[PDB]
Write a protein that binds this DNA or RNA. Structure first.
Length: 483
DNA sequence: AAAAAGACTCAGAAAAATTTTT
DNA sequence: AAAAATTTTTCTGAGTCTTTTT
């Protein structure tokens, strides 16, 4: 169904009808075989069901060094006791006297056991799996069958944040139907909660896209279940995403001229803003929103850089006015880069950097909101993130341009393609991994044009899954598309 | 005015399928 | 074939940006 060949809905309205079967809850907990033992202070101790299970989580991760760290254990053990009966709380005073080995051994067993299984067994579980997909992996939005991305409820276990995360080891509880909110069209058949239960709520909100949600206990973040990238609802937003970035293309040099001018501004705020944008524009720096203390690991972005994240070098290794960046970004991915900037920028930074402590905010007097506000003014619907797309995609365009070899073999052209990709991955700082940018930053039409231009079969670049994702791009693109 | 809540994009790990060698 | 290597898929965490609320 070439949904791209249809009329987009008004703004706000996401669909008119929607019907799903709700989430597949995590299966029940089967207790350990009586032969599988736990010991506390070297004394066999059979645990309460809830307690046992939790111990199993830990027991199941015992080999990761994860389990050696202080936050993890502290976080872990605390939560576990909560799940203990009173009397258990009385005996297990600490985690250090617990023996999860028999527990650890057991599962490892189960592991290899599975890793060696009969082929028939291998197929039985696939057919099983497949059956699941047919039953809960699709929904009906408006007039068609659409696949649901994540239909399996998040299973209880131990929280695993990125980097030096303060909530590492905390227990994720089991989500009950009483925690789930259902989103569907009023006229649609309501999925029936499991026997003996009730949904938290059933809503019919067509301004949103999700079919189910609930709140994740450890961060209080709302989780959702939405459709597949192949969705119209998904593919449309993405097509629009790239559309916007091309609009930026069309007024980038203008915006640029402005900020360069603002560097000169009287009001320092205007200056911080402008420098900040310089970076975003030039280095592809993220917004850098203000994170809630103690909730996540310490990672910063453009607007949230603390003065200690950059080191100013009037000169270094040949170049002058070099900015040395060194911080952890989203997912705690490290950002390190020595950058020769405009003398003006450099000068502003010294100024932004004076009279402060290492922990102070470089661009104090500035935030993402302030930033984006100005951006939208410059261009309707313009945000810091648009810059990243624009850059990636535009970088891909020229790179492939200058790199694409006419007197080249398909095998050869593919590499040209992949190098052009590295350049992007490089700027986006994906760690090197071309996946993210290929999948989320590059206007696929660019790749479709190229394949066509160079008589290279899409199949050679895009995998099955990706093709389904970029089908719009695939079906509606000239050899002559130009981002 | 601002902060908390809400929703949707993008991120690498872990795992599972596939392929490629030995 | 085994087992090692690579690619694909699943998972859900981590941001951006928005809207509600106070």
């Amino acid at each position: 169904w070439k949904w791209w060949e249809e009329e987009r809905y008004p703004e706000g309205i996401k669909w008119k009808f929607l019907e799903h079967k709700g989430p597949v809850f995590a299966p029940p907990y089967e207790p350990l075989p009586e032969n599988v033992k736990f010991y506390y202070d070297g004394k066999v101790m059979k645990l309460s069901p809830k307690a046992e299970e939790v111990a199993t989580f830990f027991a199941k991760m015992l080999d990761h060094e994860y389990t050696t760290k202080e936050i993890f254990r502290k976080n872990f053990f605390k939560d576990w006791r909560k799940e203990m009966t009173n009397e258990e709380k009385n005996i297990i005073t600490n985690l250090s006297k617990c023996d999860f080995t028999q527990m650890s051994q057991y599962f490892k067993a189960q592991t290899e056991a599975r890793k060696q299984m009969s082929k028939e067994e291998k197929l039985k579980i696939k057919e099983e799996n497949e059956k699941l997909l047919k039953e809960y992996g699709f929904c009906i939005m408006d007039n068609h069958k659409e696949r649901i991305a994540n239909f399996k409820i998040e299973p209880p276990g131990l929280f695993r944040g990125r980097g030096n995360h303060p909530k590492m080891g905390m227990l994720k509880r089991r989500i009950m139907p009483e925690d789930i909110i259902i989103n569907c069209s009023k006229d649609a058949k309501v999925p029936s909660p499991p026997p003996g239960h009730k949904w938290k709520e059933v809503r019919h909100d067509n301004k949103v896209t999700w079919l189910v949600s609930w709140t994740e206990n450890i961060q209080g973040s709302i989780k959702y279940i939405m459709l597949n990238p192949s969705s119209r609802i998904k593919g449309e937003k993405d097509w629009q995403k790239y559309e916007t970035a091309r609009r930026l293309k069309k007024c980038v040099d203008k915006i640029r001229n402005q900020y360069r001018e603002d560097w000169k501004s009287k009001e320092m705020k205007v200056r911080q803003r402008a420098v900040a944008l310089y970076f975003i524009d030039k280095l592809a720096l993220r917004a850098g929103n203000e994170k809630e203390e103690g909730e996540t690991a310490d990672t910063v972005g453009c607007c949230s850089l603390r003065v200690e994240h950059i080191n100013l070098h009037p000169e270094l290794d040949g170049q002058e006015y070099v900015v040395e960046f060194d911080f952890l970004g989203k997912d705690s991915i490290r950002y390190y880069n020595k950058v020769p900037v405009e003398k003006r920028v450099f000068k502003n930074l010294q100024l932004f950097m004076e009279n402060k402590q290492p922990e102070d905010d470089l661009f104090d007097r500035l935030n993402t909101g302030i930033l984006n506000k100005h951006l939208q003014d410059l261009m309707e619907g313009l945000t810091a993130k648009v810059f990243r797309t624009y850059n990636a995609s535009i970088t891909l365009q020229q790179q492939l341009k200058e790199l694409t070899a006419p007197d080249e073999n398909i095998p050869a052209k593919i590499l040209s393609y992949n190098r052009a990709n590295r350049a992007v991955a490089i700027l986006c700082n994906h760690q090197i991994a071309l996946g993210t940018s290929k999948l989320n930053f590059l206007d696929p039409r660019i790749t479709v044009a190229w394949c066509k231009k160079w008589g290279v079969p899409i199949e050679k670049i895009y995998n099955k899954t990706q093709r389904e994702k970029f089908a719009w791009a695939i079906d509606m693109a000239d050899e002559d598309y130009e981002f």
